[PDB]
Amino acid sequence: MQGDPDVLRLLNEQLTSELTAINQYFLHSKMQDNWGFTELAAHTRAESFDEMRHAEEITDRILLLDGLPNYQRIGSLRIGQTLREQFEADLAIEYDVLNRLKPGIVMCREKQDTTSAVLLEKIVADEEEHIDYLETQLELMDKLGEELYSAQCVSRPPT
Amino acid sequence: MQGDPDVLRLLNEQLTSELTAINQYFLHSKMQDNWGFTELAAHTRAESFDEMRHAEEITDRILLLDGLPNYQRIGSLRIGQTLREQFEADLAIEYDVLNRLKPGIVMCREKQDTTSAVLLEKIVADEEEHIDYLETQLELMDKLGEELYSAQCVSRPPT
Amino acid sequence: MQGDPDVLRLLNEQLTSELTAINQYFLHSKMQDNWGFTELAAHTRAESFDEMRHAEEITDRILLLDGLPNYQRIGSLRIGQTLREQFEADLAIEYDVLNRLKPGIVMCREKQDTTSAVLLEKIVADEEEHIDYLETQLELMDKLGEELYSAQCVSRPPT
Amino acid sequence: MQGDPDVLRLLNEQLTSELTAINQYFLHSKMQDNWGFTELAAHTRAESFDEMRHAEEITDRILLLDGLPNYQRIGSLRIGQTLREQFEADLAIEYDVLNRLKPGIVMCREKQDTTSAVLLEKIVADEEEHIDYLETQLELMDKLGEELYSAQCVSRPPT
Amino acid sequence: MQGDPDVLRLLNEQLTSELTAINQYFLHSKMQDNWGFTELAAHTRAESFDEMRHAEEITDRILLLDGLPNYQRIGSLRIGQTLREQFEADLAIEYDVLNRLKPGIVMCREKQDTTSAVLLEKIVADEEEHIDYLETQLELMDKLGEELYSAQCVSRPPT
Amino acid sequence: MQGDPDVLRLLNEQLTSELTAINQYFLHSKMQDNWGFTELAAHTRAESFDEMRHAEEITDRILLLDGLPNYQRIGSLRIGQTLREQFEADLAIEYDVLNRLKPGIVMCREKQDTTSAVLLEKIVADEEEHIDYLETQLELMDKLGEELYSAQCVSRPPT
Amino acid sequence: MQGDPDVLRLLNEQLTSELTAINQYFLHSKMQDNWGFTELAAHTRAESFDEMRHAEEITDRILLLDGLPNYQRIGSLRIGQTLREQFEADLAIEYDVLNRLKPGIVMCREKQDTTSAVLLEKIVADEEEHIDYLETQLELMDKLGEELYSAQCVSRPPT
Ligand code: HEM
Ligand code: HEM
Ligand code: HEM
Ligand code: HEM
Structure with missing residues (x-):
């Protein structure tokens, strides 16, 4: 069994994206935790885990189609x-993912x-x-103001 | 059994008020949750459930009295x-409910x-x-200020 | 984030459908209850709830896409x-929903x-x-006879 | 270990009968359920499961006697x-089963x-x-009437 | 309700394939058990069971669509x-299922x-x-060599 | 068994450091609690207990080294x-501890x-x-503002 | 609190190795699982998780030291x-890590x-x-032979 080559590039592209996101x-979650915004950092952490899960899932797909999953390539961090x-x-x-995936799903189908x-x-x-x-x-x-919003991301007491 | 015509009309009017309120x-709960005021959102959602319950209760009364519950008419949303x-x-x-109900009660009796x-x-x-x-x-x-009040309506962290 | 306008119009159209169905x-359920078809009534009721849930789900999709949910509009009750x-x-x-949704889906994609x-x-x-x-x-x-079917919809004893 | 050829041929015959029956x-159970006769449908389903077991049982025996079980052949569905x-x-x-099995046993013996x-x-x-x-x-x-009997085969309320 | 005649033929073809596979x-599970590859047979048996489930699922859909499920027709066993x-x-x-379904899903849509x-x-x-x-x-x-792989398909001790 | 004079000198210097800290x-915990900053106050108290344990562990090491733990000296409190x-x-x-123990750690080895x-x-x-x-x-x-940060150190309601 | 610039560069080097190793x-565990060497794959997974953990710890340290953890750089995968x-x-x-670390620790001291x-x-x-x-x-x-070794990396029955 072998996957369609355009699909595999697409998959690998997305995989690279997931790795960048993880x-x-x-790092954003650790930085948030370090700044003392612990409550937010747990949320952000969970997001990375979600991305990590996405990376594993794609990896299995690529493998079942006999592809090489690209673990080497990394995207540019902001x-x-x-x-x-x-x-x-x-x-x-x-947003970059949506831009790649919207067309990509149609192609896959x-x-x-x-x-x-x-x-x-x-x-x-x-x-x-x-x-x-x-x-x-x-x-x-904006609605709460930046300082007020931020206070909602610490715990009582902070750290 | 058959209801007094005036009472049934008052009951129907109230029903339309409930349907409007539900x-x-x-929608307001959905909006507040969507802007991230989740804690307030749960409260608003309950108040809507409260109206669903009133509406059902009005419907029962109407039917008991050999009435036609009006589920077609709806009020103007704000x-x-x-x-x-x-x-x-x-x-x-x-306020419209009090205005309607206060004489309406004296009439029912x-x-x-x-x-x-x-x-x-x-x-x-x-x-x-x-x-x-x-x-x-x-x-x-007013007492707290708007932004500060709003902050009390979000969880930690927000959404 | 912003929805395709047509998609959003589709969604709203479905919402209006859901709200009319609820x-x-x-109403039907309350009436079946009122006639003493209590057993059947409970199923119909469950159907109304399923719609209430469809309404919430669509409402979320619309808010997600920065759309404006329409709770003002309702359709013609039968x-x-x-x-x-x-x-x-x-x-x-x-059947009205299927007629709308089938092409609707193709469009969404x-x-x-x-x-x-x-x-x-x-x-x-x-x-x-x-x-x-x-x-x-x-x-x-048709197979049972109407009255005999109807008997399957009452509790023992009735109501 | 080697079975008698006549016996094995009889077992494969009965196996064909089972497969047919299953x-x-x-199907009949699936058909009764879609008609709304959910209560009867459950029994008929059980009867098919019983036939699945008999085919497994005959399948073991044929295998134990060094026979080739016939899973290719199916009889005429009614x-x-x-x-x-x-x-x-x-x-x-x-009755086709009794007709076959009754002489078939004395033969086995x-x-x-x-x-x-x-x-x-x-x-x-x-x-x-x-x-x-x-x-x-x-x-x-005949005793109950056909419709009345059919009514015994549905839940309350139906489906 | 009544489905597309092409969709119903595709579902019926697929139904035939499911019954053939079951x-x-x-039989293959039973042969593997007979041979003493008991650990492997259990897996095989699950796979045939999975196909029994797919057969049922196809059947429900066909009956929903007012189609006639073909339980008479079988494939060629290997x-x-x-x-x-x-x-x-x-x-x-x-591979045959994949051949049929890949175009058929496109068709169904x-x-x-x-x-x-x-x-x-x-x-x-x-x-x-x-x-x-x-x-x-x-x-x-190939990696383990056939005898060794085979060793992994038996209990300790065997059967 | 006998500790090195220089080392013992260092353990005692530190011990003084620990009592001062305790x-x-x-006192900072108690004052913070007085002020109504009860939530922060609890974390501070815990820091004090940490020091209290540190003092005890140093004391034993000094005792095991045939030393005389100084429970008479104290540093200046700020x-x-x-x-x-x-x-x-x-x-x-x-910082006064780190500055002492850094070169001190090297000296002990x-x-x-x-x-x-x-x-x-x-x-x-x-x-x-x-x-x-x-x-x-x-x-x-700085980030939250002093008044806001301070509001994260009190309970709801205050004390 | 600012870390020593050399120490920070070392921590960052090691982080790089950890991301590479993870x-x-x-990938290796995913590949082994894929080949059906399930039993080994689970251990290999556990190894990757260990470096995931190493990575996290090193990250805290750099952050504690006012450093900037490099999550951009990855090393050559083999x-x-x-x-x-x-x-x-x-x-x-x-072996690359032991090489880097042996002198780095001494440097850190x-x-x-x-x-x-x-x-x-x-x-x-x-x-x-x-x-x-x-x-x-x-x-x-070598002691068992590659084939025999491999047989111990699979379950009974395989995958
Ligand atoms: C790049 C830096 C990474 C960091 C800092 C990191 C960190 C972590 C940590 C600390 C855990 C908890 C696991 C445990 O307690 O043993 C975890 C879970 C996990 N990681 Fe990563 N990881 C990284 C990369 C990756 C990558 C590239 C993958 C590829 C799949 C991955 C897959 C997983 C999976 C599948 C879990 C468990 C998810 C769950 O528990 O549901 N990780 N990660
Ligand atoms: C947009 C319109 C409505 C929406 C979105 C809506 C949504 C919901 C939802 C999500 C529930 C919870 C269902 C569950 O148990 O999972 C509910 C409950 C209920 N609804 Fe509605 N519903 C609507 C209209 C109505 C109407 C018109 C009535 C008529 C009287 C009604 C009667 C009720 C009742 C009686 C409950 C049980 C309330 C409780 O105990 O929590 N609903 N609705
Ligand atoms: C080749 C002849 C078949 C044999 C020998 C067979 C055998 C079996 C056996 C032994 C069971 C477990 C029975 C029990 O719990 O009492 C079973 C379950 C089942 N059978 Fe069959 N069967 C056959 C064909 C079919 C067919 C044609 C269908 C319908 C399309 C079907 C549908 C099912 C379903 C849905 C289950 C339960 C599935 C589960 O629990 O995972 N089988 N079969
Ligand atoms: C200078 C003022 C001090 C104050 C106000 C203070 C206060 C307290 C109090 C109230 C307790 C709780 C007692 C209990 O549970 O019965 C406690 C526990 C303790 N104290 Fe002190 N203490 C001081 C100094 C010290 C010193 C100098 C040491 C050792 C040299 C010390 C060692 C400990 C230890 C080891 C605990 C055990 C509680 C735990 O952490 O599990 N304390 N202290």
Whole structure:
């Protein structure tokens, strides 16, 4: 059994994306924890875990289709030096995923590979949830003000 | 058994008020949860469930009296785009209920329909609490300030 | 994030459908209860809830896509006056959904909005099951005889 | 270890009969459930499961005697389009089994193959009971009325 | 309700394939058990059971669509006389499913029958997993050598 | 058994450091509790108990080394009069320990007293987490604002 | 609190090795599982998780020291093509760490940063155990024969 080659590139592309996200998300969570925004950092941590799970799932798909999963390649990280830049950085990678996946699923279906399209379909839904979560944080930051918003990310007492 | 025509019409009018309220309140909970005010959102969602229950209770009374429950007619929604706006809109519908129900109760008793009256008295009591809750929130927004009040409506961390 | 306008219009159209179904299904259930078809009534009730859930799900999708959910609009109720009439009425609405959704889905995918599409796919599947049930019920009335079918809808003793 | 050729041919014959039955019985059960006769459908389903076991049992025995089990061959399905037709079709396959097994056992015993004869005797006891159930159901259709009997086959409320 | 005649032929073809597989798989499990490869047989037996489930699922869909499930028609069995022959035989039936379904799902969507399409989309995923397992065992036979692989398919002690 | 003079001198210097800390931290905890900053106050108390254990472990090592633990000397306390002055005052002592134990740890390994050295290494590690926590608290006052950060140190409601 | 710039560069070097190892080890376990060597794959997975943990700890330390953990840089993966190539590759990376760390710790002690040294000493020790396991796996490959070794890496029955 061997996968369609355009599909495999697509998969590997997405995999590379997931790997970048695991790292960006994780380091952001540690940085959030270090700044003392512990309550937020757990959320951000969970996001990295979610991305890690996505990476494993793609990996299995690639392998079943007899491909080589690219563990070498890494994307470019945007590492935020503020909470606001951090959410912004995270937003950008998820948008990059949507931009790649929306066309990609259609291609997968045109290639008669429903299983792959289905996996990509799930990822897209998850990323949408994430983006929605991230944009709402920026919305809140303005509505509450930045300092007030930020106080909601610490614990009582902080750290 | 058959209801007094006037009472059934008052009951139907109240039903339309409930159906209106269920929607306005439910949508507002969805909106507040979506802007990330989740903790407030749970409260609003309950108040909507409360209206669902009233509506069912009015429906039962109507049917008992050989009436036709009107599920077709709906009131004019006031959808707010800030928390304040939302609170004020909900207040408005509650006030219309008191305006309708207060004479309506005195009429039910003249017609000798105590059971419909007691039902309506119960709704009045419930709407008075809601108004007290809403009116208070509005008070707090001023006392605390709007942003600070809003902050108390999000979890830690937010959403 | 922003939804394709057509997709959002589709979703809203479905919402309007759901809101009409909740009311028509609820009303029917209350009436079946009122006639003493308590057993049947509980199933119909459950159907109304399924719709209430479809309404919430669609409402979430719309908010996610920065759409404006329409809780103002409701459709034309078909309130049956016999079980057979109710069954036909309910069927008619379900068929309206299938007629809308089937092309709707194709469109969602062209527009590359899989998440919405999947949301609609589940709904279609759900409505197909509902139509099968109601159509079976009519077959049963014919096969059993109407009165004998109706007896299967009362508790022992009745109500 | 090597079986008698006549015996083995008899077992493969009975195996073909089972395979047929499993298909007929299962479909009929699926058919009764779709009609809304969920209560009868459960029993018929059980009857098919019973036939699955007999085919496994005969399958072991043939294998133990160094035989080739025939899973390629299927007999003529009789699919009923009414409950009465279904009960009759089911009875005919059952009587074909007794007709074959009764001389078939004496043959097994004559050939000095008791274990094989014992397995067949058990199938016969089992088929006799199924036949009694079926013939009784037809008597009940005449005793009760066909519609009234059919009403005994649905839940409350239906499906 | 009434489905597309093409969708119903595809579902019926697939039904034939499922019944063929249930049979080849089950016999193969029994042959492996007979040979003393008990640990392996249990796995094989599960696979035939998985196909029994797919057969039922297809059946429900066909009946929902007012179609007539074909339980009379069977495929051509390939019964293997070695473990290697069996894996290859089973692989051959799976590849065939993939051949049928890959175009058919595209077709099902074209005809706006998402529920039938999703169902087959699921069978594709399952068959893909089963192929992956089967291709792996054959690879394990070359890597380990056949006798050694075979050793891994028996209990301690055997049967 | 006899400790090296230089080492014992170092253990005693540290012991003095620990008693000073116990007092300074315990009083800061009590003052913070007085001020109504009860939630922070609990974390501070815990820091004091940590020091109390450190003193005891040093005392035993000194006793095991035939030394005379100094429970008569104390350093100067910096009692802070705001939350900010307390955090700076605590940090200042923390740094005074690191400055002493860094060269001290090297010296112990030189006189060949690994056990004493490791005891110190642990203290240093512990002391490091303490500094990072305090240095993070001061940043948060800047980031959140002093009034806001302080509101994260009280309970709901205050004390 | 600022770490020594040399120590920080070392921590970052090691982080780089850890990210490299996490990927290699994870891919290798995914590949082994794929080949059906399930039993070995689980251990290999556990190894990758260990480096995931190493990575996290080193990250805290750099953050504690006001450092910037490099999650951008990854090293050359050596992906193995047989169980043997896989063991030999993972070994090579492990040896690279002992090489880097042996002098780094000494350096850390000189710059007087024991807590960093201690973390590294703990990595050096775990790495030794890993090397000893892998070295032993190769040895058993010779003692048993590659085929026989491999047979102990699969379950009964395989995958
Ligand atoms: C790149 C830096 C990474 C960091 C800092 C990291 C960190 C962690 C940590 C600390 C855990 C908890 C596991 C345990 O307690 O043993 C974990 C879980 C896991 N990681 Fe990673 N990891 C990284 C990369 C990866 C990659 C590239 C993969 C590829 C799949 C991966 C796969 C997993 C999986 C499958 C889990 C368990 C998820 C679960 O518990 O549901 N990790 N990670
Ligand atoms: C947009 C309109 C509505 C929406 C979104 C909505 C949504 C919901 C939901 C999500 C539930 C919880 C269901 C569960 O148990 O999982 C519910 C409950 C209920 N609904 Fe509705 N519903 C709506 C309209 C109505 C209407 C018109 C009535 C008519 C009287 C009604 C009657 C009820 C009742 C009686 C409950 C049980 C309340 C409780 O105890 O929590 N609902 N609704
Ligand atoms: C080749 C002849 C077949 C044999 C020998 C066979 C055998 C069996 C056996 C032994 C069981 C377990 C029975 C029990 O619990 O009492 C079973 C279960 C089942 N059978 Fe069959 N069967 C056959 C064909 C079929 C067919 C045609 C269908 C219908 C399409 C079917 C559907 C099922 C289902 C749905 C289960 C339960 C599945 C589960 O629990 O995982 N089987 N079969
Ligand atoms: C200078 C003022 C001090 C104050 C106000 C103080 C206060 C306290 C108090 C109230 C307890 C709880 C007692 C109990 O549970 O019965 C405690 C526990 C303890 N104290 Fe002190 N203490 C001081 C100094 C010290 C000193 C100098 C040492 C050792 C040299 C010390 C060692 C300990 C230890 C080891 C505990 C055990 C509680 C635990 O951590 O499990 N304390 N202290």
